[PDB]
Symmetry: C3
Subunit: 411 residues, 3 copies
């Protein structure tokens, strides 16, 4: 049946004016001009001009905050009598602290010489992190898009459009196809910028998410809402000796995740960025790595036999019915779309979830004549995004905001 | 030397009837019809019909079972006298439990007031998981294949064949090439379905495999063979106080892997599925994500100059000699093939490992005239799979089953 | 503006002598011969010969050493009096050991019957690994390149060149384009060879790097500099009983990472290798997996309208100014290049970082007429590599060595 998702052309190669076929780095732009033969005139020439922008990476991201370095500290506070809750402890002022209480445990083989208590008091053990310093900014990739602006001019008619890395642009007599390739980044990668965005960063595959312990990548994060402190990898001990104050011991890791990373820094992957652009839910940049190459094919055919394979009689109207799920999420939001099809018995097409600035996901819709209900998934966006059901360049007149994502550590 | 692995055509573009070149979403089908000029007749027309199915993902998988939620529980059982083995404990009835025994350790600074024992008895500490509930079904990806059914009709001759995502189909006068792209899934990804397959799921990159501790993704799994219980991340302590029964303490993680995941659910990647088909060793589905696009090129040339580049004089016969390794495995099985070559001094070709329904791997064989011994690797399959050495559409007359895979946790 | 990075051709398809378009396995070579029509003579024919090598994988690697199996051992050494430093312990001779000291802690509820000490002596607890045996060799992937040697002969002129997997080769009348595909390996993957390189190996996504605990993949590594021993996942305990020598206990993992891996071996991905070649900073091989296919397109056009799209008037000279960063690193080294442009107002081109044998990275340089300062990133190489700024086939006359990478565990 009908579909408008085939983006390309049918041609008779005998009737083709020009074909360009080449490899181009993702971070390279390209310009091409040529005077083509006027078949009707054969005196005055028809200009052809092609412009391809550099490929721009658009990563929907989660702002994870600032990764922090810190120094590990362990302190003992002993009281012969009294519950642990009775006393204040110096570590309770720290950015991060964890306290283990040995309450009502005094005994004459573990007491200082001035303490005759038995089953009393408190040995309070405190681990606290201080000298907290931001070492960089951290982003988690929600999704990736790779686009070039493509401008075609043949005679006096120009068409410019943003084209994704494995898509084609088709005009009256011109087809430009991009064939993507290698992807350096993957969804759920974590990017760490140790300095300004322009200086590039490090890719981490195993940034701590469901359990963060001191020593992990991402163990200590500073966010606008506050510190997010790690758990401890190791365990406390109350060392006892006759006529001696108890001594807190900790047997686990005492070196921050940042210092452990730096010690073996060259185990990780760097990436570099040019022209970075930061937005509410996204980072855009051009990767100066010229080893990443796309394949480009351009056809010009001013002949009646040139076919736009996306052309169908089918027409659709869209309305955004409901939403659930979250913005800024790799799980995403689910948009419910009412899609009405005319002029065709059936129509396979692509329905997109877009806000006023950007699209966040597209679903193949198998439509039948009349009304259809289509669920589509979007990933990314922010709390102000009004998500709409869209097709080609047209969107529904109303949009819906999604809920806030769930990105909480349990402790 | 000769090879039949080049799937494509040589043509004179002047002698080409038609070329289609376009981008198509993996989840889109496409149909194209055209009446082509009869060069011998030029009155009656020759029909051309192209049909491309939607691309189907075939993932060989490991059925990891059901991921379970649970509640953490800690209990103390003290006996003044008697070995720990002498007594039964209530946690010994649980789906998962871990017990730490403090045996023959009684002393007058750690005993209840009715216990004068010294170096006797037992403080038994039990961690047990209860309220076990399945939260979803889990599959590990062994391998991935992406195929479309491609049908070509020119005049009265039709050819339909399954074509992989970076392969070509060649008939007498027609070539259809697919150029694959982005892959959302990777081998060793773990897929979690929280509900029916049709509702999609979550991708996990770090599902616990060699060490599973309570709190990890995949910590508690229910399989047909029984529960697979996690180890503990943390350590026990016997808290002592005069004239008091010992109290078991546990300092580690007490929150299940499921609850930790849900708390930060939007850190993970969702995927959606249509038309899912479950089999003994595999899951097949169509991904409704229309942002994944393949490149398609179609050539029609009813001219004598159209060359099938896969044509050679070389002929082979195959026999399956032996096997080792495992089914259902990302390491795979190794099939030993005796391949006999005639009509050519040398022949580079592809030898496949297939059962009666499916192929599981292909190896480039550098053959010389006469008999050859070729080792090929297959991944996936099940205990009933009779694996055969195959070439093109022909297989050896005998096959061999592989051994069961090793997928055991140590404790 | 001008760029030489577009590798391909502009043609009039009517003026094309021949087009080949086909899919080819990465591990397949291919040969094609044809006698083409001489347009000037039309009696004697012009030979065309195409040869494509098998695709070679070049992985820049880090030699991580040998992964070791071992047996866990725990021993107690008690002394009624004396500091722990006073005594030698048998575990101090082991390849790996970790010692926990309970110093000055004697008491009459934890002493052997011959020890009346109070707050004296030492219970020394030693974990040591013995029966250390190498189980395989380990390499971490720094970067990946996929190349074919491509030879073109038309008449008496031959051109052979190494072509990357998404690049094109252009001669006077011939264009050969490669379109890459699926990549089985990723940067930062860890490869384990349990035997000779020819027997293949296992891919690990989560080899321990910043924290290695006994039981992890990569926990125990033997390098030329010495053993790199893991930390412990678990904690010690001094078990006390009246009239009994203290007993050291360890509650954590006691099974090596190798044994845990082997127990669930079929959870991991195997890969196979042919014609492996080992060098100071790299491993090269051909993957016999024939399911990995590239797309190949060949155009021959002996017509004046055939355009080399890489041709520009722009000319550059290079000098290598300075370097920082490290060899053998996925973070890489940063080479500072002085690039001088003539014949053009502006020129977008690719500047490479190469030593005498190999290139390690390329950067898109946006040059303006006159002198430019360009920073480029290279990954890989070794301590003897003299890295140079290069363009096309030309390099600066001087090069600079980089510093040694930081690949240290903290303990
Ligand atoms: C490509 O990306 C890498 C990774 O980000 C870049 O390495 C980074 O380079 C910056 C600047 O050279 C380093 O910043 C710091 O600067 C202070 C001066 O304030 C300096 O004293 C410190 O020693 C420190 O190096 C940053 O640490 C470094 N990051 C890493 C992970 O090595 C690289 O420069 C980029 N290459 C380009 C843009 O050509
Ligand atoms: C695309 O895939 C995602 C991920 O699986 C889908 O999200 C999932 O949606 C289902 C159904 O809406 C959720 O199921 C559960 O249903 C009960 C009712 O019995 C409901 O009360 C619960 O609140 C729960 O949501 C499932 O939790 C959810 N999974 C995740 C990880 O969020 C999504 O709906 C799919 N989009 C489509 C098919 O358009
Ligand atoms: C493709 O690669 C896999 C993974 O390396 C290969 O499996 C490996 O096969 C070798 C040789 O068969 C195994 O070596 C060992 O040999 C001793 C004899 O000295 C044998 O007694 C042991 O049982 C052991 O198997 C190696 O263990 C095995 N590795 C794994 C991870 O299974 C496979 O053979 C390759 N297939 C080819 C080259 O066709």
């Amino acid at each position: 049946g009908w579909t408008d998702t085939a983006h390309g052309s049918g041609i008779i190669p005998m009737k083709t004016d020009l074909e360009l076929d080449f490899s181009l780095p993702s971070s390279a732009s390209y310009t091409y001009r040529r005077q083509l033969q006027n078949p009707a005139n054969e005196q005055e020439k028809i200009p052809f001009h092609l412009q391809l922008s550099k490929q721009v990476i658009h990563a929907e991201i989660q702002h994870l905050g600032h990764w922090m370095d810190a120094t590990f500290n362990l302190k003992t506070a002993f009281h012969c009598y009294g519950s642990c809750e009775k006393y204040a402890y110096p570590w309770q002022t720290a950015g991060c602290f964890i306290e283990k209480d040995y309450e009502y445990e005094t005994g004459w083989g573990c007491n200082p010489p001035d303490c005759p208590g038995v089953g009393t008091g408190c040995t309070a053990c405190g681990v606290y992190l201080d000298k907290l310093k931001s070492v960089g900014k951290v982003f988690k990739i929600v999704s990736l898009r790779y686009t070039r602006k493509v401008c075609i001019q043949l005679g006096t008619e120009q068409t410019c459009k943003t084209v994704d890395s494995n898509d084609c642009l088709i005009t009256t007599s011109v087809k430009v196809c991009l064939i993507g390739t290698i992807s350096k980044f993957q969804p759920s990668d974590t990017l760490l910028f140790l300095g300004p965005l322009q200086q590039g960063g490090l890719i981490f595959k195993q940034w701590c998410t469901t359990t963060c312990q001191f020593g992990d990548p991402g163990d200590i994060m500073s966010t606008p809402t506050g510190m997010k402190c790690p758990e401890l990898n190791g365990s406390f001990r109350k060392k006892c000796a006759f006529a001696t104050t108890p001594v807190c011991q900790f047997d686990g890791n005492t070196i921050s995740g940042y210092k452990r990373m730096i010690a073996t820094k060259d185990s990780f992957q760097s990436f570099n960025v040019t022209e970075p652009h930061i937005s509410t839910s996204a980072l855009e940049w051009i990767d100066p790595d010229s080893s990443l190459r796309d394949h480009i094919n351009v056809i010009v055919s001013r002949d009646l036999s040139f076919q736009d394979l996306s052309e169908t009689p089918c027409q659709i109207d869209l309305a955004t019915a409901s939403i659930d799920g979250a913005w800024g999420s790799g799980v995403g939001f689910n948009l419910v779309c009412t899609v009405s099809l005319t002029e065709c018995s059936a129509f396979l097409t692509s329905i997109k979830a877009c806000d006023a600035a950007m699209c966040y996901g597209s679903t193949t819709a198998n439509l039948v004549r009349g009304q259809n209900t289509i669920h589509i998934v979007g990933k990314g966006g922010h709390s102000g995004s009004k998500f709409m059901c869209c097709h080609d360049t047209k969107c529904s007149s109303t949009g819906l905001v999604a809920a806030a994502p769930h990105l909480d550590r349990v402790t």
